[PDB]
Amino acid sequence: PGLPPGPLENSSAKLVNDEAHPWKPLRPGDIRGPCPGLNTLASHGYLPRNGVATPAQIINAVQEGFNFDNQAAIFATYAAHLVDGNLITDLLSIGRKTRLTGPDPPPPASVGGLNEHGTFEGDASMTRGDAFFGNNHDFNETLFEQLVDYSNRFGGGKYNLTVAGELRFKRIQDSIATNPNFSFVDFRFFTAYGETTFPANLFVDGRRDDGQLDMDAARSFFQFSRMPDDFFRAPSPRSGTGVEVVVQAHPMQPGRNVGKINSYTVDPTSSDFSTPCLMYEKFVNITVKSLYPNPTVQLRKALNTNLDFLFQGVAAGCTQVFPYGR
Numbered sequence: 513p514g515l516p517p518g519p520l521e522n523s524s525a526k527l528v529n530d531e532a533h534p535w536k537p538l539r540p541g542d543i544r545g546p547c548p549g550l551n552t553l554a555s556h557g558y559l560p561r562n563g564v565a566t567p568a569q570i571i572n573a574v575q576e577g578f579n580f581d582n583q584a585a586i587f588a589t590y591a592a593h594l595v596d597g598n599l600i601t602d603l604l605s606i607g608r609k610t611r612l613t614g615p616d617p618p619p620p621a622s623v624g625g626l627n628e629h630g631t632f633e634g635d636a637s638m639t640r641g642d643a644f645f646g647n648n649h650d651f652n653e654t655l656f657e658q659l660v661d662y663s664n665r666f667g668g669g670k671y672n673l674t675v676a677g678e679l680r681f682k683r684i685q686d687s688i689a690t691n692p693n694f695s696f697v698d699f700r701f702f703t704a705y706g707e708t709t710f711p712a713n714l715f716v717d718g719r720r721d722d723g724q725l726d727m728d729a730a731r732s733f734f735q736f737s738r739m740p741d742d743f744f745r746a747p748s749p750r751s752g753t754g755v756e757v758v759v760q761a762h763p764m765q766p767g768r769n770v771g772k773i774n775s776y777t778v779d780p781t782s783s784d785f786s787t788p789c790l791m792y793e794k795f796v797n798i799t800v801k802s803l804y805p806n807p808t809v810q811l812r813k814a815l816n817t818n819l820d821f822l823f824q825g826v827a828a829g830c831t832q833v834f835p836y837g838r
């Protein structure tokens with residue numbers, strides 16, 4: 513495994529839809545998944561165009577192409593890789609499970625790519641359906657049209673943090689009403705809020721950086737994995753700034769439906785925004801450990817290396833935990 517890349521040496525706004533990074537359509541076998549950011553980076557050649565990449569490639573791409581901040585890049589990438597990637601070959605699919613990530617580890621590890629439900633990916637996504645409904649990864653036109661409607665109603669036709677606050681809650685309530693297996697705890701509880709800020713913070717042309725995403729650009733990213741012509745990345749490193757506005761709009765507790773619709777039951781063992789270090793500890797002690805309960809020598813070493821890298825992305829003040837010793 514390569515070392516996690518450091519922050520950008522020059523984080524100014526600049527043209528990122530440039531001659532070296534043209535949009536190209538998918539070829540047979542090219543993989544796209546539930547993340548429009550990574551999808552767009554792959555479709556502009558910031559990542560390998562087939563959608564299989566190393567953690568270091570992913571971190572470099574999100575920084576270079578979108579000015580995603582280093583700490584957020586490290587945490588997200590190594591979390592995803594630990595639960596969805598191949599730790600021996602150092603390869604992660606940004607979408608469906610693929611033989612291209614190499615020989616699989618033993619069960620119960622799945623190495624399912626970002627499409628794997630319940631490891632990283634989860635319910636109440638904005639433009640992707642819940643896994644229960646049959647497809648957690650493809651762009652969904654009806655859900656996107658709802659995003660447009662919420663942008664018209666709360667953002668004057670643009671997507672901004674006010675729109676994010678209302679749409680986040682709408683998607684939660686729709687999943688409660690229709691998905692008897694709806695889960696909204698721990699890792700997903702956190703990412704579900706942060707992700708709604710990303711279109712406002714990262715898909716807005718960096719010469720403006722005003723938090724108001726137009727619907728032409730929104731469709732280009734969300735559906736076609738395509739930067740607008742002449743797209744400048746954000747003018748400084750960021751990820752989830754303004755997430756407090758989204759939470760404040762409709763504060764929620766972590767919980768799940770309990771095998772029936774309209775049965776949302778709060779989980780007091782879940783982390784929430786008052787316990788960010790617990791989210792990290794549970795992710796390692798429960799989620800990662802359950803995939804690799806008794807790893808053989810080379811897997812144990814790879815796990816420990818990637819867990820060290822994950823901890824570099826954890827907010828200061830948390831204590832590192834060691835599921836396979838020091």
Ligand code: HEM
Nearest residue numbers: 546547549574578580588592633634637638639640707714
């Ligand atoms: C740094 C590594 C990244 C990883 C591993 C990653 C992975 C993911 C995954 C797995 C999801 C699906 C979440 C779910 O259903 O629970 C997601 C959602 C999302 N990601 Fe990323 N992501 C990364 C960076 C970024 C960046 C840099 C951007 C924007 C420039 C971005 C924009 C989004 C958006 C907008 C969604 C929400 C899609 C929707 O709900 O319709 N992500 N990401």
Ligand SMILES: *[C@@H]1O[C@H](CO)[C@@H](O)[C@H](O)[C@H]1NC(C)=O
Nearest residue numbers: 521522523524525526527528
């Ligand atoms: C950083 O990049 C910007 C945009 O390409 C450029 O104008 C600026 O001069 C660069 N700064 C340094 C210190 O090289």
Ligand SMILES: *[C@@H]1O[C@H](CO)[C@@H](O)[C@H](O)[C@H]1NC(C)=O
Nearest residue numbers: 629630642643644645693695
């Ligand atoms: C149902 O929820 C459980 C966890 O509560 C999860 O393991 C499973 O993958 C979920 N399946 C779908 C399709 O939502």
Ligand SMILES: *[C@@H]1O[C@H](CO)[C@@H](O)[C@H](O)[C@H]1NC(C)=O
Nearest residue numbers: 640641645647652653654655
């Ligand atoms: C898209 O989402 C809608 C609304 O939840 C759902 O009814 C539909 O089956 C999804 N899939 C497609 C292919 O439209």
Ligand SMILES: *[C@@H]1O[C@H](CO)[C@@H](O)[C@H](O)[C@H]1NC(C)=O
Nearest residue numbers: 666667668672673674675723
């Ligand atoms: C979203 O846009 C609407 C209409 O322009 C505006 O009232 C609201 O203040 C905006 N919110 C943010 C956070 O920019």
Ligand SMILES: *[C@@H]1O[C@H](CO)[C@@H](O)[C@H](O)[C@H]1NC(C)=O
Nearest residue numbers: 790793794797798833834835
């Ligand atoms: C995680 O495991 C460590 C021991 O390796 C323990 O000290 C810590 O309390 C655990 N945290 C949780 C939330 O289970």
Ligand SMILES: [Cl-]
Nearest residue numbers: 519581582749
């Ligand atoms: Cl940074």
Ligand SMILES: [Mg+2]
Nearest residue numbers: 633634635637
């Ligand atoms: Mg999802």
